[PDB]
């Protein structure tokens, strides 16, 4: 219970922020002014939400995004090779081989 | 392969069909093998149809990128496939286009 | 005609991604005269590429026509290559084409990115009249996308993949070598000059590695050890071309009717002057074979031999 508690106050962390980012600023009990504004602007994201960048840097967080993935398929891939039992495997494949 | 005496298109549809990548490897890509032009584009598609992950693979690593054989027409052939593991696209077309569909119906990309 | 060429300035410079087998691999890449001083071309490769000088120059001489390599070889070359480029921070200087010792080059680093971390800053000094495009390349600095596909009706060839950087150097002329040879030995005499960090006065190291080759491959040899400061060499046995010649002369040191190979123009025309020139100077000629003697090892060879 703690730890799935944890886990969903975590996640809940985003409706939070997302839900007083889009409040208006004044309190409930002065927010009547706020009505009136959006009234007055019935008839008439930079951030918070998203991060608008250039081409150049859409270029450079690609470029790093790749680099990321293949030194993860690398580093699997390593981690794979060196564990015991495929060494076991490997090697009592290469000793039936040598002894056939 | 030798015994048939055909070309090389011939030889990677049969390797295709028995689902033997390592015949293909060792013995149809080889030097100078001289395909002819949009022979290499067809077995890429035929792989990509019967779900031939190793023969894409392949065929990758042998020339063909994917940016000059994608295109409209063949993701719609590739969609509109009837060989493969068993799917629920045509119901959630049904679903989503509410009935009124005929058989022998053309998935269109709009209703994907 | 005598050599009448536009002097017109470069139209083809930026970087290429290599469309084709399974890999992302850039590669900056520029056009420059045959003519260009060597000062320029280091100080791009040093500044603009932002290239730290190397600490050891490997030169990789072969034939032109591609050939094959049995196994056994291969696997004990290639990876010996790599680990002598990749141990040492250094250079190494191809034909950059896809054919030949340079095939070779290109899949011994193919088989190194698939299963070790960094980079081999390996250069390709390729003309730039035997480019199968010399389309899709005449665009400034901007990437363009590059088709690996061979097309054997085409008589060109196409730039090897898996090479970091090229020089395209032109002439003019269009679909015949011998645009870079010159620019390329060059570029290698003006770096060995140039200065290592050390403070002793030593210069950057150069050795030489040659697989198969050919009647030129002699000359070039031979070039190499006739400079003023000797280059030493590293040649093969199991290639059967020109460097096996070299390894049979190195035996018995100081047998001329065995000069027919049906290789040249028959016995009136024959190159064992130039061969006894360069078996003259042997302490630098080095040698490698498998199990039949020491240095097992590529890289053990190359290291030993500077």
Not at chain 1, 17 to 26: A, D, G, S
Request: include cysteine; charge should be neutral.
């Amino acid at each position: 219970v703690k730890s799935i508690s944890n886990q969903v106050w975590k996640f809940q962390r985003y409706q939070l922020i997302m839900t007083f980012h889009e409040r208006p600023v004044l309190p409930p009990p002065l927010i009547i002014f706020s009505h009136m504004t959006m009234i007055f602007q019935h008839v008439c994201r930079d951030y918070g939400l998203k991060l608008f960048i250039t081409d150049d840097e859409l270029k450079k967080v690609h470029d790093f995004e790749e680099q990321c993935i293949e030194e993860y398929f690398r580093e699997k891939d390593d981690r794979f090779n060196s564990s015991n039992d495929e060494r076991i495997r490997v090697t009592s494949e290469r000793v039936e081989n040598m002894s056939m | 392969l030798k015994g048939a005496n055909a070309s090389a298109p011939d030889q990677l549809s049969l390797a295709l069909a028995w689902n033997r990548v390592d015949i293909a490897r060792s013995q149809i890509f080889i030097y100078g093998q001289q395909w002819p032009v949009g022979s290499l584009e067809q077995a890429m598609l035929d792989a990509l149809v019967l779900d031939r992950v190793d023969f894409v693979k392949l065929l990758i690593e042998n020339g063909v990128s994917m940016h000059r054989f994608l295109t409209i027409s063949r993701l719609e052939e590739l969609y509109n496939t009837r060989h493969g593991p068993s799917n629920t696209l045509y119901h959630l077309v049904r679903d989503v286009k509410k009935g009124n569909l005929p058989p022998d119906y053309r998935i269109s990309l709009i209703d994907i | 005609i005598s050599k009448h060429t536009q002097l017109s300035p470069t139209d083809a410079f930026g970087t290429i991604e290599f469309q084709g087998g399974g890999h992302s691999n850039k590669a900056m890449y520029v056009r420059v005269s045959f003519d260009t001083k060597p000062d320029l071309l280091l100080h791009l490769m040093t500044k603009e590429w932002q290239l730290e000088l190397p600490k050891l120059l490997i030169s990789v001489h072969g034939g032109l026509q591609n050939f094959e390599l049995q196994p056994k070889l291969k696997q004990v070359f290639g990876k010996g290559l790599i680990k002598a480029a990749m141990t040492t921070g250094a250079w190494i200087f191809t034909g950059g084409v896809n054919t030949g010792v340079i095939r070779h080059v290109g899949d011994a680093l193919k088989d190194h990115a698939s299963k070790s971390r960094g980079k081999i800053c390996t250069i390709g000094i390729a003309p730039w009249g035997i480019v199968e495009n010399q389309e899709d390349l005449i665009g400034r600095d901007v990437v363009r996308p590059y088709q690996t596909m061979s097309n054997p009706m085409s008589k060109l060839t196409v730039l090897n993949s898996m090479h970091s950087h090229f020089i395209l150097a032109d002439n003019g002329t269009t679909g015949k070598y011998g645009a870079e040879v010159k620019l390329r030995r060059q570029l290698e005499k003006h770096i060995s000059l140039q200065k290592i960090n050390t403070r002793i006065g030593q210069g950057v190291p150069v050795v030489a590695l040659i697989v198969e080759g050919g009647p030129n491959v002699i000359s070039i040899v031979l070039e190499y050890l006739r400079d003023t400061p000797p280059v030493p060499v590293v040649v093969c046995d199991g290639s059967g071309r020109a460097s096996d010649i070299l390894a049979f002369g190195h035996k018995y040191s100081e047998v001329t009717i065995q000069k027919t190979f049906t290789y040249t123009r028959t016995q009136a025309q024959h190159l064992f002057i130039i061969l006894m020139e360069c078996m003259k100077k042997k302490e630098l000629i080095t040698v490698f074979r498998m199990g039949s003697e020491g240095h097992q090892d590529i890289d053990l060879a190359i290291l030993t031999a500077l």
